Each structure stands twice: as structure tokens, then as C-alpha cells.
Design a protein around this ligand. Structure first.
Ligand SMILES: CC(=O)N[C@H]1[C@H]([C@H](O)[C@H](O)CO)O[C@@](O[C@H]2[C@@H](O)[C@@H](CO)O[C@@H](O[C@H]3[C@H](O)[C@@H](O)[C@@H](O)O[C@@H]3CO)[C@@H]2O)(C(=O)O)C[C@@H]1O
Ligand SMILES: CC(=O)N[C@H]1[C@H]([C@H](O)[C@H](O)CO)O[C@@](O[C@H]2[C@@H](O)[C@@H](CO)O[C@@H](O[C@H]3[C@H](O)[C@@H](O)[C@@H](O)O[C@@H]3CO)[C@@H]2O)(C(=O)O)C[C@@H]1O
Ligand SMILES: CC(=O)N[C@H]1[C@H]([C@H](O)[C@H](O)CO)O[C@@](O[C@H]2[C@@H](O)[C@@H](CO)O[C@@H](O[C@H]3[C@H](O)[C@@H](O)[C@@H](O)O[C@@H]3CO)[C@@H]2O)(C(=O)O)C[C@@H]1O
Ligand SMILES: CC(=O)N[C@H]1[C@H]([C@H](O)[C@H](O)CO)O[C@@](O[C@@H]2[C@@H](O)[C@H](O)O[C@H](CO)[C@@H]2O)(C(=O)O)C[C@@H]1O
Ligand SMILES: CC(=O)N[C@H]1[C@H]([C@H](O)[C@H](O)CO)O[C@@](O[C@@H]2[C@@H](O)[C@H](O)O[C@H](CO)[C@@H]2O)(C(=O)O)C[C@@H]1O
Ligand SMILES: CC(=O)N[C@H]1[C@H]([C@H](O)[C@H](O)CO)O[C@@](O)(C(=O)O)C[C@@H]1O
Ligand SMILES: [Ca+2]
Ligand SMILES: [Cl-]
Ligand SMILES: [Cl-]
Ligand SMILES: [Cl-]
Ligand SMILES: [Cl-]
Ligand SMILES: [Cl-]
Ligand SMILES: [Cl-]
Ligand SMILES: [Cl-]
Ligand SMILES: [Cl-]
Ligand SMILES: [Cl-]
Ligand SMILES: [Cl-]
Lengths: 120, 118, 118, 119, 119
């Protein structure tokens, strides 16, 4: 069991994207946020964010951004691994969410995406 | 609300892009500007720039550039958050604008774009 | 022969890609993994990973990611060089594998891929 | 007017591209050059270059290259701002030119390219 | 002439690409190699490599790689400038080559590629 990989939404698509610069607390940050759909439906949790200088995992901001962007471009089916209730900037969470983006993997069927699932 | 996110234009397209290097004050800078339209119309503020070593927020130059270029390439509907009357180099502002680029988010209808609204 | 180039699969395709951030041991890491098919079949070794701050070769993370993603986009025949039984984090291996990604070369025919062979 | 923005070619296309590594003096450098055309014509200035550790603006090498490469790909109309008589290495300028690349902007018509112009 | 720019092959296509990590001479390195064709033929020197921590010019590894990947993608006509027999790790040379990548420029036709040429 990988820590932080037990909260995911599978077979979703990235259909919105935000990227910006922002001062939060006392730090100048960059952030991006993905908006999620599942076909014509909107998943329960639909907005996941990553911030360069805040979070449980500060590494990989540029790589995650490029990855998100590619998937937004193709619109393909992906699994999004995320972490709930991370951001405490109430201004930020009101506008986007408290969710922190952890990983994105691809799917090869309505039923299977790459990466760990809750056993079983 | 999010500081610096109260000034924006929704459902615009990035129909022109400028990138260049330039000496301003006594500092060597990089800059890019987006030119905007809303359909056949030109909005109030239509030129918005970001500069690597100047501005209210200096971070994110490369990621903001890569992002603007993506949207220039697709011609898709976006919202642009910016900050007014930032640049003090009067040669620059005359040629482009005094507007600093803060964020770019995507839009799915004339109603909804991602990010905070007022 | 070249150290670490004795183990490979030729003429497979990358049909899935994983990228994420993860704490392993005491380190904050990035990883990505390619998932492999050979046509419609799954090959013996089907999952190969690279991690920025762990491995036989920590260099080239961004360039290896960029390369994988490229071949994922095209779906072309590649030959993949890898090192088995590298990762010792048993939560990682169970979720992906213990194979470390060493190199990716291209293929012009079902008979030839670039790079050393045994 | 912006200092280095008086010299430009409008509504051209980048139809050739060079990139390489080169020792000039005792300084190891990278350079890239754009080759220009105007539809079927070739403008007065047809070769323009940027070098990572030489020139009037050493910054923005990676971004300028990515920008030029993109425009090379789409082959679209751009405006090119440059600086003449920069490069002192006579081997380099005989091989390419003495022109330094300052900026690249896009054009939405034959009448308009983004960026300043003269009177 | 430009030092290191007198050895080249014009109007070739990059038809193969290798990228990997590797330990040589007790240093941890990245390398990539382009493989070349000329139409239905294979030029005299068909494999040219660049290595991040070794070579006559160690700069520009990411930019050269990105450049070579682009031309692998398009399969278009290019001129490759290289330097011969630089690599001394015989494992590597037997597997790939001993040639170091110096520059890549684009061609408009079989008469003209960008960059310095011999008379
Ligand atoms: C492209 C450009 O405009 N560059 C100029 C920058 C930018 O306008 C600025 O960084 C964006 O915020 O500004 C430069 O001039 C500033 C500098 O001389 C500082 C010196 O401390 O003063 C600034 O004015 C301040 C002033 O210091 C405060 O007392 C108070 O009045 O606020 C004003 C707000 O501007 C100058 O604008 C710079 O070098 O930083 C000149 C650049 O050409
Ligand atoms: C993602 C992951 O698996 N990370 C683990 C890493 C990687 O397996 C490793 O870096 C791959 O090269 O390994 C970690 O555990 C190693 C660490 O405790 C070191 C301390 O010296 O010991 C390693 O085992 C060695 C051992 O040191 C040798 O004496 C001999 O027994 O061989 C083994 C072979 O590995 C541990 O693998 C790490 O801390 O780097 C744990 C990571 O979670
Ligand atoms: C991929 C690879 O082959 N790496 C080897 C490198 C490169 O071939 C080299 O950098 C090419 O420029 O070479 C290594 O061995 C060199 C090293 O031991 C140095 C010591 O400083 O000597 C080099 O040969 C010199 C020689 O010392 C001089 O007398 C004169 O002949 O110049 C030559 C230049 O080739 C060795 O080639 C290295 O570690 O740098 C071994 C690498 O595996
Ligand atoms: C944290 C969590 O709830 N994870 C669930 C996930 C979400 O609950 C769900 O997506 C909320 O929108 O749902 C998962 O299972 C899904 C199925 O319930 C659905 O019928 O089909 C989906 C694929 O199209 C998906 O398999 C999921 O997204 O994987 C299960 C997961 O643990
Ligand atoms: C190092 C060297 O000899 N370089 C030559 C080059 C090579 O010999 C050749 O590429 C080996 O395959 O050949 C050059 O001239 C070429 C002609 O030999 C060829 O018939 O047509 C080529 C264009 O398709 C080209 O004109 C070259 O590649 O430029 C000359 C170069 O110095
Ligand atoms: C974008 C954001 O929400 N930043 C906030 C962070 C993050 O919530 C945590 O770092 C999450 O781990 O927490 C703070 O206490 C901090 O570190 O300054 C306040 C800050 O404003
Ligand atoms: Ca051509
Ligand atoms: Cl754990
Ligand atoms: Cl979890
Ligand atoms: Cl949400
Ligand atoms: Cl993309
Ligand atoms: Cl304006
Ligand atoms: Cl496997
Ligand atoms: Cl010229
Ligand atoms: Cl074209
Ligand atoms: Cl245009
Ligand atoms: Cl060869």
C-alpha cells in the first residue's frame, strides 16, 4: 500500500485548467488546478490543485503541470490520485479546493487505469 | 477573496503573442505579452504582459509563457486575470501596456470560466 | 559490453504512463512508470519506472520522462533497456514494479531497433 | 520607443533553423539562427541569431529558441526584431550573420503585427 | 571558418533516436544518439551522439536533444555537423559511435542547407 495513493478518481477527463501566480501566507507561489468530468457528468470531487511552495509534496510542480496539460489537450481517460483537505488558505479553497494533486495515470479501458487500487 | 484576482477578462481569446528580450532600468529582462480579442471585438484591456525580473509576482515566467503559448495555439476561450498600472518603463508601456499577467484559466461556456469571480 | 544494457525488450509499445509524487524512505521523490504492450499481448516485464532521487542512475529524470511521454504519444515500436529488482520499497514495487528504466531507443522494423544487443 | 526595437522585418516566415555548440575564444557557447523568407521572397536581412553567452542580451536563450522553433513549425507570419552588427567573431558572421535576435511577435494580418513600429 | 564546423553531412534524415543513462569512466552520464539515413541509403557515418558530462562541447545537452527529437519527429532534410572519433569508451562506441554531435540545421532543397559549407 503506497501512502497517499488511496484516494483517486478513475476514468475521468481533465476539461478545465487554471495556472496562476499568487501570494499565500507569506510566500509567493505558483499554482495550477485541474477541473474534472466523467463524460457528461461531474465527479464528486472535481477540482484538484498543486502549489510549488506549499503542500504535502512540493516536488514535481513543472512535471505535474506539463503532464496535466498534455492530458487536457488529448482529453483522454485518466486516473487522478489526490489528497483531501490540504490547503488552509481559505481564500484559495473557496475559489478552487483543498485537494492536492498527487499523481496522474492513464487508462486502457472503462475499467482499468495504471497504478494502485484499494486492495481489493 | 484571492489577493490580485479581482481584475479579469472572461471568454477572451489570445490572438497575438509577443516574446522578447529587453534592457529596462539597468536590468536585463525577458518579457511576453498576449494580445486579446473577444470574438470579432477587442476588449477594454487587450494587452497583458509578464516580465521575468520585474513585477508584483516574478515567479512563474516560464510556466506562464508555456501556458499562454498553448492557448495562443488552440485559440480557445480563456479568462485572464491581470493587475493594472504595474510597469513604470514608459517606453515599454507605450509599446505594449502597463498590465501584469496574473493567471490564465479555461472556459466551457460564455458563463463559466474556472477560478474566482466577484 | 555496456554496463546495464544487457536487459531489454524490443518492439514493444508504451500504452500507459504514470507520473506522481511520493515519499519513500525519508526522501521526497518524483517517479514515473511506463506500461508496456507488444501488439495486443502483455510482455513478461510490462512495468518500468524511473525515480528522481533513487536508483542505479538518478540523472536524466526530466529527459527520460519527456522521452517516454513522446513515445506514449506516438505509440511507436521502441526497445526498452531496464534493470530488474532495483526498487526495495515494497509498497512501490507492489503498485508498479521493481524495474528501473535505463534507456529507450527507436525501431525502424520488427527486425531492428537502435542500440546494443546480445 | 524601446531601445532595441527599431529594426525589424514584418510579415515574414521562419523557413530555416540552425542550432549548435561552438567555442568562441575561450568561451563555450550555444547558438541558434533563424532563416527568413517573405512568401517567395527573401528579405534584406535573412539570417538572425542568438547566442547564450554572447551578445547585447544574453538572457532568454531557451525561451527564444523554443519560440523560434514553434514558429518554424507552424510556418506562420511573424515579425522579427533584430540588432545588426552585433557579432564580432568574423567566422561566425561569414557563416551566418552579424544580426542578433531581439524579439518575435505574431501577425494577425498583412496590415498588423503585434509590437511597436516606427513613424 | 568556424572551429569544429568543417565535418558534416547535408540532406540526411534523422530516422532513429536513442536516449539513455549510463556510467562511463566512473561518471554518471546521460547520452542520446541520432541515427541517419539519406533516402533509401545509409550515409558513411550514420550514428552521431551527445553526452552530458563528456565531450569537446558539454554545453547544450537538453537543447540539442530537444532539437534532435524535433527532427526525428518530422523526418525532414537536415545537415548534421559532428566531430569524429571523440568517445573513447569502447563499450559505448561499439554499441553506438565515437562521433560527437556539434550542430543540426535545416535544408530548403538539395542545393542549400543553413550554415557554413566548404567551397
Ligand atoms: C518594465 C518596467 O516597467 N520596469 C521598471 C520597473 C517596474 O515598473 C516595476 O518593477 C514593476 O513594479 O520599475 C523600476 O523602477 C522602480 C524602482 O526604481 C524603485 C526603486 O526602489 O522605485 C519604484 O517606484 C516605487 C517607489 O520606489 C516607492 O517609493 C513607491 O512610490 O512605489 C513606486 C511604485 O513603482 C520604481 O517603479 C525598477 O527598476 O524596479 C524601473 C523599471 O524600468
Ligand atoms: C522507490 C524505492 O524503492 N526506494 C528505496 C531505495 C531504492 O530501492 C534504492 O535506492 C534503489 O537503488 O532504497 C532505500 O533502501 C536502501 C537503503 O536503506 C540503503 C542504505 O545503505 O540500503 C539499501 O540496501 C542495499 C544495502 O545497503 C547493501 O548493503 C546490500 O544489502 O544491497 C542492498 C540493495 O538495495 C536499501 O535498498 C534507500 O533508503 O535508498 C529505501 C527506499 O525506499
Ligand atoms: C562516453 C565516453 O567514451 N567517455 C570517456 C571519456 C570521453 O571519451 C572523453 O571525454 C572524450 O573527450 O574519456 C574518458 O577517458 C579520458 C580521461 O581518462 C582523460 C584524463 O583526463 O584522458 C583522456 O584522453 C586524453 C589524453 O589524456 C590526452 O593525452 C590526449 O590524448 O587527449 C585525450 C582526449 O581523448 C581520456 O579519453 C574520461 O573519463 O573522460 C573515459 C570516458 O569513459
Ligand atoms: C476516494 C473515492 O471515493 N474513490 C472512488 C471513486 C470515487 O468515489 C468516485 O469516482 C466519485 O466520483 O470511484 C471509483 O469507482 C468508480 C465507480 O464507482 C464508477 O461506477 O465507475 C468509475 C469508472 O468510470 C470508477 O471505477 C473510481 O473512480 O475508481 C472507486 C474509487 O475508489
Ligand atoms: C566528412 C565528409 O566527407 N562530408 C561530405 C559529405 C559526406 O561525405 C557524405 O554525406 C557521406 O555520405 O558529403 C557532402 O556532399 C554530399 C554529396 O557527396 C552527395 O552526393 O550529395 C549530398 C546531398 O544529398 C551532398 O552534396 C555533404 O553531405 O554535404 C559533402 C561533405 O563534405
Ligand atoms: C496555498 C495554501 O493553502 N497555503 C497555506 C499552507 C498550506 O495550506 C499548507 O502548507 C498545506 O500543507 O499552510 C500555511 O499554514 C503555511 O504553510 O503558510 C498557510 C498557507 O497559506
Ligand atoms: Ca525543409
Ligand atoms: Cl507506508
Ligand atoms: Cl490515501
Ligand atoms: Cl472539489
Ligand atoms: Cl501539451
Ligand atoms: Cl491595454
Ligand atoms: Cl513488470
Ligand atoms: Cl542576413
Ligand atoms: Cl509550413
Ligand atoms: Cl497569424
Ligand atoms: Cl557510424
Amino acid at each position: 500500500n503506497m501512502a497517499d495513493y488511496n484516494t483517486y478518481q478513475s476514468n475521468v477527463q481533465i476539461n478545465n485548467l487554471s495556472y496562476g501566480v499568487y501570494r499565500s501566507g507569506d510566500k509567493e507561489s505558483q499554482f495550477f488546478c485541474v477541473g474534472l468530468k466523467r463524460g457528461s457528468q461531474v465527479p464528486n470531487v472535481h477540482t484538484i490543485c498543486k502549489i510549488d511552495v506549499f503542500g504535502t509534496h512540493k516536488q514535481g510542480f513543472d512535471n505535474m503541470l506539463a503532464t496535466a496539460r498534455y492530458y487536457y489537450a488529448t482529453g483522454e481517460d485518466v486516473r487522478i490520485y489526490y489528497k483531501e483537505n490540504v490547503w488552509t488558505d481559505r481564500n484559495f479553497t473557496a475559489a478552487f479546493s483543498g485537494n492536492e494533486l498527487i499523481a496522474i495515470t492513464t487508462c486502457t479501458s472503462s475499467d482499468y487505469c495504471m497504478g494502485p487500487t484499494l486492495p481489493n
